[PDB]
């Protein structure tokens, strides 16, 4: 279930499971998936199956990963890439665009058999500069990943949050990890807690 917002003249749906759906572009946006950052006690399969649920829920002609799809060199692993191959060939017609992050650079471009269009930040889909790193763009509003934004609630709970802002907006990390960059409670931006999508 989703929270619609207007942002720079576009209707964007913030998804409870840490994704943005862009209806006019029939596009699903996520960031910091970190396939291969799984521990052994959160799984690669669970992450891919989590994508399959969003892709079945919404008309997605394309998926755009704002950086950090595969974790590292131990994510170019025999078993692990096999599961991604499995997943990709179940969505043969989906276009998958990866904007390269510091982990995509480190590991290297995903193998060509997986049919992933690798591009360099910024990748501009008007009105938006899509980026991994949240650097301001010279002319466009930015949608970015990289920082793994969370918001701290006390009674502490680190919840993943969207940061919707005029110049640089942040998507929450799609991977399921501890930590995250604590977003200041005094920010002059719109915050949505991606457990519903909870505004502030
Ligand atoms: Mn990351
Ligand atoms: Mn990063």
């Amino acid at each position: 279930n989703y929270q619609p917002i207007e942002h720079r003249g576009q209707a964007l749906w913030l998804l409870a499971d840490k994704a943005i759906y862009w209806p006019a572009r029939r596009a699903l946006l996520v960031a910091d998936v970190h396939i291969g950052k799984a521990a052994s006690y959160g799984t690669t399969e669970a992450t891919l199956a989590r994508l399959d649920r969003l892709l079945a829920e919404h008309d997605c002609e394309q998926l755009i990963i704002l950086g950090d799809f595969l974790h590292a060199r131990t994510a170019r692993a025999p078993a692990t890439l096999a599961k991604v191959e499995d997943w990709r060939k179940r969505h043969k017609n989906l276009k998958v665009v990866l904007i390269r992050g510091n982990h995509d650079r480190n590991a290297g471009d995903p193998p060509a058999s997986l049919d992933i269009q690798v591009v360099d930040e910024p990748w501009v889909l008007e009105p938006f500069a899509l980026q991994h790193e949240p650097q301001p763009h010279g002319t466009h509003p930015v949608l970015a990943g990289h920082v793994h934004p969370v918001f701290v609630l006390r009674g502490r709970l680190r919840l993943p949050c969207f940061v919707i802002d005029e110049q640089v907006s942040l998507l929450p990390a799609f991977g399921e990890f501890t930590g995250g960059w604590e977003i200041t409670p005094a920010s002059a931006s719109r915050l949505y807690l991606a457990g519903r999508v909870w505004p502030l």
Side-chain angles (χ1 to χ4, degrees):
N1 200 348
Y2 64 99
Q3 153 93 21
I5 70 180
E6 222 170 316
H7 183 51
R8 313 295 298 199
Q10 298 290 312
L12 301 174
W13 299 0
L14 312 187
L15 310 187
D17 203 359
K18 282 136 50 166
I20 298 187
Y21 179 74
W22 189 355
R25 301 272 193 159
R26 286 168 49 217
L28 182 74
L29 281 58
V30 305
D32 302 285
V33 189
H34 293 271
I35 298 283
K37 187 183 271 287
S40 318
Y41 323 96
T43 325
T44 299
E45 291 110 357
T47 301
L48 293 175
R50 267 207 300 137
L51 286 162
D52 281 355
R53 182 190 105 131
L54 301 167
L55 295 163
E57 274 177 38
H58 304 104
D59 186 13
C60 298
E61 165 206 302
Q62 70 186 315
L63 167 73
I64 309 179
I65 300 134
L66 307 195
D68 285 2
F69 187 56
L70 301 168
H71 181 55
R73 304 219 96 106
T74 325
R76 296 199 322 306
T80 293
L81 270 180
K83 311 192 199 153
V84 191
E85 265 135 18
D86 285 336
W87 169 85
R88 207 288 181 266
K89 287 164 185 148
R90 293 190 298 272
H91 309 268
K92 281 185 196 61
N93 243 22
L94 187 65
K95 187 181 76 146
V96 178
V97 179
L98 165 65
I99 301 158
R100 253 186 274 118
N102 49 292
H103 286 232
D104 313 307
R105 262 121 48 180
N106 278 333
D109 278 1
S113 59
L114 263 162
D115 202 25
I116 289 164
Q117 191 179 342
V118 189
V119 303
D120 273 333
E121 66 183 357
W123 200 54
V124 161
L125 260 46
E126 302 283 334
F128 290 127
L130 308 190
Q131 288 173 194
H132 175 58
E133 278 196 311
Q135 294 290 325
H137 186 274
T139 48
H140 286 48
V142 161
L143 303 189
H146 180 69
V147 316
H148 305 199
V150 297
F151 195 73
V152 174
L153 299 172
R154 193 223 83 145
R156 292 135 69 164
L157 218 61
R158 235 154 176 87
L159 249 69
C161 61
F162 304 84
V163 184
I164 303 302
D165 185 87
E166 211 66 8
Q167 282 171 234
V168 175
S169 285
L170 301 186
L171 278 57
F174 189 82
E176 218 70 34
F177 332 117
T178 61
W181 189 220
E182 172 194 347
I183 296 297
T184 174
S187 35
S189 315
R190 289 190 278 171
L191 257 50
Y192 299 85
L193 272 61
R196 292 89 37 174
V197 197
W198 286 108
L200 299 105

